[PDB]
Structure 1
Amino acid sequence: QFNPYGDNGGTILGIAGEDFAVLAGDTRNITDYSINSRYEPKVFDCGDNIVMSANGFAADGDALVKRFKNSVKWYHFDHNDKKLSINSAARNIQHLLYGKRFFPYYVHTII
């Protein structure tokens, strides 16, 4: 009867330019028909010029972003402060997500 998931609303949008990229998100956090916060950011700077958002279930998104930040930290530790390329980050995030394949993160992810 206990439901481990929730829906915090929100909407995010990423656009890729020629020499730039952009990642935006609304700062509204909701629950059902009530508003939890009018400024709860969900688009984060993760370092190495990588911005990340995991919109949907706020707990799962925050967990995923925390784990990705930690992966960036340990990547810098284990490979002589090598910058994490955007494709390497994408593959690492694929593995992070698929780890919980049978208990997913209720998040749509954009970096």
Structure 2
Amino acid sequence: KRWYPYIDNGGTVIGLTGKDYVILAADTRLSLSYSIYTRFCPKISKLTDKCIIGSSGMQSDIKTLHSLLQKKIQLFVLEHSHYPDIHVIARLLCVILYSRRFFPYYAFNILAGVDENNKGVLYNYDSVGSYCEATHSCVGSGSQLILPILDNRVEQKNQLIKNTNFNLGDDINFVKDAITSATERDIYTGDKTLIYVIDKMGINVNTLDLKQD
């Protein structure tokens, strides 16, 4: 009778950065409360050659928030004749997100990219204009589950800090391990997931198949 304008379409976006890269992975399932709209709705939209954004909130807001942000970025490129750095984009997204503080986007965003020679970097937001650099972040339905997993392997409470080195290949396998754990433990996590690897030269869109339940 009141028309609450906020629904959660579920899905989780996983971010994990390394010394010279960053891995952004997300599912593709788009679902209503307990039924399923579609089995392939990408939550990750590339922004520049070396900066992509993933959002795991309400899909109507996500489509327009990414579309608004690429519209701003391309407008920035034309007026200033150079692709914005991720720090520039991250700050700009903070303004856009906070520009509607009193009717906030129902989307949680993770921004990944490279700024230095490599310096794999990653930002995470909470629906309103706030961002902190993180070594690993995940948002969405699986945020509650994956974040403990990422902590135990990236940072350490372990007595001896084993696996101090972290090659790119193992980190990809680790995210496939994580995103599969959320799939079989979370209701809304998807069935086909896209894994991005923003390396020095560009981005890969290698796809992984998950459970369909």
Task: State whether TM-score is above 0.5.
Answer: yes
8 Å contact from structure 1 (residues 11, 26) kept in 2: yes
Unaligned 5+ residue runs, structure 1?
none
Q: How much identity, in percent, do the aligned residues show? A: 35
Deviations 1:71-98 (A, max 9, x none): 1100111102x12101110000000100
* 3-state secondary structure, aligned to 2:56: strand
CA apart distance, 1:31: 0.1
The equivalent residue for 2:3 is 2
Unpaired segments ≥5 residues, structure 2: 112-213
Equivalent AA in structure 1 for residue 97 of structure 2: L
- Corresponding residue of 1:41: 42
8 Å contact kept, 1:44–1:51: yes
Equivalence for 1:106: 106
- Kindly indicate whether the alpha-carbon contact (under 8 Å) linking 1:54 and 1:64 is maintained by their aligned counterparts in 2: no
| C-alpha distance in structure 2 between counterparts of 1:79 and 1:55, whole Å | 31
Residue pair 1:54, 1:62 contacting (<8 A) in 2 also: no
Cα separation, 1, equivalents of 2:85 and 2:76: 11
Distance 2:54 2:64 in 1: 11
- Map 1:1-111 onto structure 2 (within 5 A): 1-80=2-81, 82-111=82-111
Q: Which deviates further from its counterpart, 39-48 or 68-77?
A: 39-48
> Scaled by the length of structure 2, what TM-score is found?
0.51
TM-score by length of 1: 0.95
Which structure has more RCO (C-alpha within 8 Å, separation ≥ 6)? 2
In 2, the alpha carbon distance for the partners of 1:75 and 1:104 equals 24
For the aligned residue pairs, the C-alpha RMSD in angstroms reads 0.8
Higher Rg? 2
Deviation of 1:48 after TM superposition, in Å, equals 3.4
Aligned length: 110
Equivalents in 2 of 1:46, 1:92: separation in Å? Answer: 13
